[PDB]
Amino acid sequence: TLAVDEIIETISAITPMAQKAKKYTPPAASMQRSSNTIWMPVEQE
Amino acid sequence: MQIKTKGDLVRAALRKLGVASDATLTDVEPQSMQDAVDDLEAMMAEWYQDGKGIITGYVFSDDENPPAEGDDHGLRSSAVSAVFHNLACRIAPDYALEATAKIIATAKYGKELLYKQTAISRAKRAPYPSRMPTGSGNSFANLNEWHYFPGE
Amino acid sequence: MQIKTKGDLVRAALRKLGVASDATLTDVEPQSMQDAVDDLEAMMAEWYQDGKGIITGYVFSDDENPPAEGDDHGLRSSAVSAVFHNLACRIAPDYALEATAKIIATAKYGKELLYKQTAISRAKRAPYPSRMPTGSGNSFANLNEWHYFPGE
Amino acid sequence: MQIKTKGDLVRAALRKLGVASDATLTDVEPQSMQDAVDDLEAMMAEWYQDGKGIITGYVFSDDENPPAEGDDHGLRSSAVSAVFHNLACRIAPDYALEATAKIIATAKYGKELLYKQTAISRAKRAPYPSRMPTGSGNSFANLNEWHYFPGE
Amino acid sequence: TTSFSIPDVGLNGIFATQGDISTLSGLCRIALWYGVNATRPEAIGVGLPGQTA
């Protein structure tokens, strides 16, 4: 057997939502003590 | 062939030994016949080491069918002589006998001739090692990038 | 196979010896079976050297079961001929007899066939020594950061 | 195993020799049985050269327990055949007998099989000489590694 | 161990390999830690066509 050096490509996916999603990296040292959670305020009325 | 059963093989071996045949005035008992069939079965199981021994097409009788004698042996027509000569050689001690020189020589020759074709088939050369290059002369192998032989 | 118990093995050995068969009008003396079973057990224990000898699937009887005779030997179909031929050779001196040359040759051949597959299995090559390098061409060794073989 | 005492070994040896067995009509006297047990003890003490010979697990009877016969020999299952075959060979001259060729060959094979595992265990390579260096390969690892081999 | 930067999605994980010498084998692992959060669920929506009966 000499598996030819060509590949039959089958799948081609796209990730538009994950690309458009904004990505956030809070401080790791603080998050470890805060249990991987962080609070953010809300616009005041 | 006139010899088509385990009982036929046993009777042929007995005739070769000169103990019992179709012309004698004394015969061997059916218990002796059955137990000689048992000896033949043990011989064939020993020869055919569960697929790694001498392949002859012999068919082993099952216990569901009671009489082992009366079962077609399944051997080809060229194996019968070797089979029954060796059977005579192995069951000669039952009757305080010793197989004659002609029977011994024929048994040896028949066993060798039985294994000849299997030996020819099994004389196979190993594949290339996984550490040898295929060489540049194989353009297709080089382009498909098979620089070294697969192996195994 | 029709030889499925130590009793059948003993009876086949006795018949090969010509002591108690049907070809001669001799019945198995009851004491000729206990001693033969003892000899067979001793020979099998000697062969199967606590797992480091000849592996045959023989089932050794325990002290709880009263009758040693009557148990299935457990041997494969390809070992019965060797077993009972060697048993006949071993128990021949009891009756001031001597196993014939054919029986001795069959015993030798059967023992060789018994140990053939075990020898093939045990013919294993030792691993690499602890002081070899793996070479620069060993992709797996380079990936796993093993410049030398582990040995053992 | 049916053989579990020095007298069982002696009786098996006598049965092998053909002098006396269970089916026999004339037996040997208890004084002769004690003499055979004494010869067995002598042979075992000669084999087990105070721990520097053949190891079998044989237990030597003391004078406090009166009958040396009746004690479990303590041998493994694989040693019984060799032990009683060699005992038969040793005690054959007592009864104006000479052990047969099969018995002699089995005794030789049994003694060799008895010493095989002990020979494997005792085949050991000596430590390094006291003047050999440990090599600079054993210097960067284990920063306090010795510069020379101890010896002894 | 090294990093493992996924393209398309703008995320990073780790890629580690280890080797067991007792069995002369190895293991590989691509780990990625993240969490999707919806800070304003009142802004996200869902359109459901054909919701009759």
If you write DSSP's letter for every residue of C45-57 in order, what string do you get? HHHS-TTSS----
Q: Give every strand in the sheet of E11-20, ordered side by side.
A: E2-6, E11-20, E25-31
- Token pair, residue C40, equals 């067979």
Q: Which helix (H) or strand (E) holds B38?
A: helix B30-47
- Asked if C103 reaches chain B (Cβ–Cβ under 8 Å), the answer is yes
Q: What is the Cα–Cα distance from E16 to E23, expressed in whole angstroms?
A: 19
Q: What is the resolution of this structure in A?
A: 3.2
Distance of CA C73 to the CA centre of its chain: 11
What does the longest C-alpha to C-alpha distance in chain C come to? 78
Which experimental technique did the depositors report for determining this structure? Answer: cryo-EM
> Contact C15/C23 with Cβ under 8 angstroms?
yes
> Contact B41/B35 with Cβ under 8 angstroms?
no
Q: What is the Cα–Cα distance from B23 to B15, expressed in whole angstroms?
A: 10
- Chain B residues lying within 8 Å of A2, measured CB to CB: 140-141, 144, 146
- Token pair, residue D111, equals 């003694």
3-state secondary structure C86-149: HHHHHHHHHHCCCCCHHHHHHHHHHHHHHHHHHHHHHCCCCCCCCCCECCCCCHHHHHHCCCEC
Q: What is the Cα–Cα distance from C17 to C11, expressed in whole angstroms?
A: 10
Please judge whether B46 and C81 are an interchain contact, meaning their C-beta atoms are less than 8 angstroms apart.
yes
Please judge whether A2 and B144 are an interchain contact, meaning their C-beta atoms are less than 8 angstroms apart.
yes
Which positions ≥6 away from D45 have C-beta within 8 Å? Answer: D60
Q: For E25, list phi and psi in degrees, rounded to 5.
A: -130, 180
- Asked if C16 reaches chain B (Cβ–Cβ under 8 Å), the answer is yes
For residue B86, give the nearest of C105, C56, C76 by alpha carbon: C105
Q: What is the Cα–Cα distance from E49 to B69, expressed in whole angstroms?
A: 81
Q: Concatenated DSSP letters for B68-132?
A: STTS-----TTTHHHHHHHHHHHHGGGGT----HHHHHHHHHHHHHHHHHHHHHH--PPPPPTTS
Q: How many residues does chain E have?
A: 53
- Chain A residues lying within 8 Å of E10, measured CB to CB: 19, 23
- Looking up tokens 């020379």, which residue turns up? D148
Please judge whether E11 and A19 are an interchain contact, meaning their C-beta atoms are less than 8 angstroms apart.
no
> Contact B71/B40 with Cβ under 8 angstroms?
no
Q: Which helix (H) or strand (E) holds E17?
A: strand E11-20
Which positions ≥6 away from B88 have C-beta within 8 Å? Answer: B13, B14, B16, B17, B99, B103, B107
Indicate contact of D with C: 3+ CB pairs under 8 A: yes
Give the type of residue at B82: A
Q: What is the Cα–Cα distance from E34 to E53, expressed in whole angstroms?
A: 40
- Chain D residues lying within 8 Å of C27, measured CB to CB: none
Question: Left if phi > 0, otherwise alpha if psi is -120 to 50, otherwise beta: which for C91?
Answer: alpha
Q: Which helix (H) or strand (E) holds A20?
A: helix A16-20
CA distances to A27, C66, C108, D45, D108 from C50, in Å: 65, 23, 22, 24, 20
CA closest to B93 among chain C residues: C16
- Chain C residues lying within 8 Å of D101, measured CB to CB: 98
> Contact C42/D81 with Cβ under 8 angstroms?
yes
**Which of the other chains make 3 or more beta carbon contacts under 8 angstroms with chain C?**
B, D, E
- Chain E residues lying within 8 Å of C143, measured CB to CB: 17, 19, 26
- Asked if A43 reaches chain B (Cβ–Cβ under 8 Å), the answer is no
What is the number of alpha carbons within 13 Å of residue E30 lying toward its C-beta?
A: 5
Q: What is the Cα–Cα distance from B70 to C40, expressed in whole angstroms?
A: 32
Mutual angle of helices C31-47 and C6-17, in 10-degree steps: 100
Please judge whether A19 and E9 are an interchain contact, meaning their C-beta atoms are less than 8 angstroms apart.
yes
Which positions ≥6 away from B123 have C-beta within 8 Å? Answer: none
Nearest to E17 among C143, C146, C150 (CB): C143
For residue D3, give the nearest of D87, D99, D113, D97 by alpha carbon: D87
CB count within 10 Å of CB B32 equals 22
Q: What is the Cα–Cα distance from C54 to C45, expressed in whole angstroms?
A: 10
- Chain C residues lying within 8 Å of D22, measured CB to CB: 31, 34-35
Beta bridge partners of E14: E3, E31
Q: For B33, list phi and psi in degrees, rounded to 5.
A: -60, -50
Separation in Å, CA of B13 to nearest CA in chain C: 15
SS3 assignment, position A29: helix
Please judge whether C41 and D2 are an interchain contact, meaning their C-beta atoms are less than 8 angstroms apart.
yes
Please judge whether B42 and C3 are an interchain contact, meaning their C-beta atoms are less than 8 angstroms apart.
yes
3-state secondary structure C1-23: CCCCCHHHHHHHHHHHHCCCCCC
What are the b/e assignments for E6-32, b being 16+ CB within 10 Å?
eeeeeeeeeeeeeeeeeeeeeeeeeee
- Token pair, residue D144, equals 């306090």
Indicate contact of E with B: 3+ CB pairs under 8 A: no
Q: Which of residues 23-42 of D touch C (CB under 8 A)?
A: 23
Q: What is the Cα–Cα distance from B83 to B72, expressed in whole angstroms?
A: 14
Q: What is the Cα–Cα distance from C77 to C71, expressed in whole angstroms?
A: 16
- Asked if A44 reaches chain B (Cβ–Cβ under 8 Å), the answer is no
Q: What is the Cα–Cα distance from D17 to C92, expressed in whole angstroms?
A: 10
> Contact C31/D22 with Cβ under 8 angstroms?
yes
